[PDB]
A paper describes a structure:
A primary objective of this study is to ascertain the binding characteristics of AA-II and compare these parameters with those of AA-I by crystallizing the HSAMYR/AA-II complex and determining its detailed molecular structure. AA-II effectively displaces the corresponding FA7 and FA10 myristate molecules in Drug Sites I and III while leaving FA1 intact. Although both orientations have been analyzed and refined, the configuration in which an AA-II carboxylate moiety faces R218 yields the best fit to experimental electron density, resulting in a high average occupancy of 0.99. AA-II interacts with I290/A291 and L238 from above and below the aromatic plane, respectively. K199 forms a salt bridge with the carboxylate group of AA-II, which in turn forms a hydrogen bond with R218 and a water molecule. While the space between Y138 and Y161 in the HSAMYR/AA-I complex is occupied by an AA ligand that replaces the myristate molecule at FA1, AA-II populates the subdomain IB pocket in what appears to be a secondary binding site by displacing a myristate molecule (FA10). At the newly designated FA10 site, both the carboxylate and nitro groups of AA-II protrude from this pocket towards the solvent, whereby the carboxylate moiety forms hydrogen bonds with the R186 side chain and a water molecule. The nitro group is hydrogen bonded to H146 and a water molecule. Despite the binding of AA-II, the hydrogen bonding pattern between R117, FA1, and Y161 remains undisturbed, thereby resembling ligand-free HSAMYR as myristate and AA-II bind concurrently at FA1 and FA10, respectively. However, it appears that the refined average AA-II binding occupancy of 0.8 at subdomain IB is lower than that of subdomain IIA, perhaps owing to orientation of the ligand and its relative proximity to solvent.
Serum albumin assumes numerous functions in the human body that include ensuring the solubility and transport of long-chain fatty acids in circulation, delivering hormones and other natural substances to tissues, and rendering potential toxins such as environmental compounds less harmful by binding irreversibly and/or transporting these small molecules to disposal sites. Applying novel pooled plasma HSA crystallization methods, we report high-resolution structures of myristic acid-enriched HSA (HSAMYR) and its AA complexes (HSAMYR/AA-I and HSAMYR/AA-II) at 1.9 Å resolution.
Numbering used by the authors: 3 to 584
Write the structure that this text describes.
């Protein structure tokens, strides 16, 4: 178009345009105050309106990258605040934009965002809704500078809905706080999955990513032909390749192009896309990314015909090995939306290993005739793991389920920092409560998506301050093998029990007046420390100390001299436990 800024303004609408301009500036200029950014947005928006009124007005024909770069280089504090980044202004495009991307700071060292009191938030929301929400959008964007801006805008709108509902409700905090907890977790997860996809693309390569995409789209679009799934896989891998490079505009265009193609070819792809494809440009690709699986065709044949029984297996394989393997994955994935993607990838890797070995024998058919028997234990392992864990979760409930995992995992990797052991076990308990509520058919995909997040949260923390060779091995192995590796960890036999420390197991009256969450973490922290000191304690011995501890807290909270009860009966609890263990 003659004026790309006018085209964006008309396509997005003013409100959306202004919010995305704020995010973009915040993600590049992560240290400038909110008020500086608001002025930039207003200036850009007033310029944009000139172009909408006259596409041939001055500078309206300039590229969005040129205009955006020119505006960054007008920031007066650019060299004093960002130093080296101000030298990108001496360059011409496209080198100037590439230079700017290189100086995005993923660890900007900003203070943690403190959640205000419910009444305080609801009052700010009423008195200045836009400043309240937009400031938070700026705070989140500068802290997550690679977070795809449209999706950040989508979260902002869900927050707005939470505040308009709950701030006019009788019990505001009971309404609002769980909504903010759930939204924060979702945003954390979404951010983590974006980073995970890019990290995996670079380490393991384009081929491995295309395999993941073949499985993902085949489950989603089971009625589409292989050739159509494979075309979509190529474009999706290009979308993620570009998007991981970090250029928002290039990422947005590539995504809009794929959404446009998908929506123009619904009849060849899926019957679930009609609603997404009626949505505005801004939301189309995100809607499609989250579309529900289409219903699979009825009476699909067994895979044994084309992949086991046919005389042409090795011939078809050797002609074009990745196309044949992609076809195997497509046929398996479309039939099993109830599998994790990595499970489907394990089956493809198993089939490939068998074909490489067998097609070289004189009688390949005999060699690979039982290959579908090798899939059975691979399928059953996560299936059984899900059944066992969900049944234990129903028996124990979320808190006690977290403590079951806390003990188990402290014993396997006692060297991990106690805060990390608590957070990971807590989050894994949340995966149980979320996914176990699903029917069996959807449990394993649910578990995979949330475990990907939790386990990479563990890996990156460990990466920063490593402690255990076994955790680094599971974190650096095949992502397809990441979950089985963590599951195969055994109790650390060579761990030297940590030395007793008195104040670690000293408790005060503050525990009674703490929030339920902080009291849970306080107790979970001490349970980890208990196992790190007595790693060989049996489950009976541990339950007894936990039962003793529970009596000690409820007796000393109702005590009228609370402080001395906690000290006196605490010395008793510790001395009794030190003899009931070891
Ligand atoms: O934990 C935070 O600091 C945090 C606090 C928050 C959030 C988010 C947060 C994060 N995070 O993990 O940084 C990611 C997010 C990703 C998308 C959307 C929102 C958030 O929106 C309101 O208060
Ligand atoms: O990668 C995925 O999980 C994903 C899965 C998908 C997709 C898309 C996906 C993504 N993504 O990045 O999420 C972006 C997209 C952008 C434009 C069009 C489609 C998609 O359409 C169906 O299955
Ligand atoms: C993309 C996010 C846009 C706005 C999100 C914040 C809206 C106000 C709620 C912030 C309160 C703190 C949230 C928290 O710490 O859990
Ligand atoms: C200088 C960049 C900010 C102004 C232009 C931002 C345009 C973002 C496009 C958002 C629409 C994406 C559509 C999609 O994801 O499919
Ligand atoms: C569209 C190309 C599909 C190619 C299929 C490759 C064969 C499937 C095996 C997948 C192995 C992935 C390696 C890994 O990440 O562990
Ligand atoms: C409490 C943990 C969540 C519920 C049980 C999950 C079962 C283990 C993982 C299942 C499969 C994950 C993806 C995979 O490895 O194939
Ligand atoms: C925090 C360091 C220890 C991390 C322990 C690995 C977590 C195991 C994930 C594998 C599936 C979890 C469900 C299960 O307990 O079987
Ligand atoms: C040497 C150990 C001294 C005794 C201290 C016991 C600390 C164990 C904390 C038990 C936490 C589990 C209780 C709960 O979650 O309700």
């Amino acid at each position: 178009h003659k004026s790309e800024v006018a085209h964006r303004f008309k396509d997005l609408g003013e409100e959306n345009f202004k919010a995305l301009v704020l995010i973009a500036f915040a993600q590049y200029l992560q240290q400038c105050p909110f008020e500086d950014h608001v002025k930039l947005v207003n200036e850009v928006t007033e310029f944009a309106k000139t172009c909408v009124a006259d596409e041939s007005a001055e500078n309206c024909d300039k590229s969005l990258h040129t205009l955006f770069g020119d505006k960054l280089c007008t920031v007066a504090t650019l060299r004093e605040t960002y130093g080296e980044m101000a030298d990108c202004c001496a360059k011409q495009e496209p080198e100037r934009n590439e230079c700017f991307l290189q100086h995005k700071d993923d660890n900007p060292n900003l203070p943690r965002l403190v959640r205000p009191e419910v009444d305080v938030m609801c009052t700010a929301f009423h008195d200045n809704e836009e400043t309240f929400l937009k400031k938070y959008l700026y705070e989140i964007a500068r802290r997550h500078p690679y977070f795809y801006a449209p999706e950040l805008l989508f979260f902002a709108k869900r927050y707005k809905a939470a505040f308009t509902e709950c701030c006019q409700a009788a019990d505001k905090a009971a309404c609002l706080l769980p909504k903010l907890d759930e939204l924060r977790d979702e945003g954390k997860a979404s951010s983590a999955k974006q980073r995970l996809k890019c990290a995996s693309l670079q380490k393991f390569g384009e081929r491995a990513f295309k395999a993941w995409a073949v499985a993902r789209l085949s489950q989603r679009f089971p009625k589409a032909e292989f050739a159509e799934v494979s075309k979509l896989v190529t474009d999706l891998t290009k979308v993620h390749t570009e998007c991981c490079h970090g250029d928002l505009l290039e990422c947005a265009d590539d995504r809009a192009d794929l959404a446009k193609y998908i929506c123009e070819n619904q009849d060849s792809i899926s019957s679930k896309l009609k609603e997404c494809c009626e949505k505005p440009l801004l939301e189309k690709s995100h809607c499609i990314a989250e579309v529900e699986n289409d219903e699979m065709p009825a009476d699909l044949p067994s895979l044994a015909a084309d992949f086991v029984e046919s005389k042409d297996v090795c011939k078809n394989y050797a002609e074009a090995k990745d196309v044949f393997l992609g076809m195997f994955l497509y046929e398996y994935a479309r039939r099993h939306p109830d599998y994790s993607v990595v499970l489907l990838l394990r089956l493809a890797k198993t089939y490939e290993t068998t074909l490489e070995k067998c097609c070289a024998a004189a009688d390949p058919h005999e060699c690979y005739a039982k290959v579908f028997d090798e899939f059975k234990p691979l399928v059953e392992e996560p299936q059984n793991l899900i059944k066992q864990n969900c049944e234990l979760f129903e028996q124990l409930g979320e808190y006690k389920f977290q403590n079951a995992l806390l003990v188990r995992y402290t014993k396997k990797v006692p060297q991990v920092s106690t805060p990390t052991l608590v957070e990971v076990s807590r989050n894994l308990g949340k995966v149980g409560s979320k996914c176990c509520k699903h029917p069996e058919a959807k449990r394993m995909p649910c578990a995979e998506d949330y475990l990907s997040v939790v386990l990479n949260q563990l890996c990156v923390l460990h990466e920063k301050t490593p402690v255990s060779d076994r955790v680094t091995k599971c974190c650096t192995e095949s992502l397809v093998n990441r979950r089985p590796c963590f599951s195969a960890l055994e109790v650390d036999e060579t761990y030297v029990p940590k030395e007793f420390n008195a104040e670690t197991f000293t408790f005060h009256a503050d525990i009674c007046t703490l929030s339920e969450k902080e009291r849970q973490i306080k107790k979970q922290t001490a349970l980890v420390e208990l196992v790190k000191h007595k790693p060989k304690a049996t489950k009976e011995q541990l339950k007894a100390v936990m039962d003793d501890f529970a009596a000690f807290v409820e007796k000393c909270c109702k005590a009228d001299d609370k402080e001395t009860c906690f000290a006196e009966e605490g010395k008793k609890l510790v001395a009794a436990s030190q003899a009931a263990l070891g």
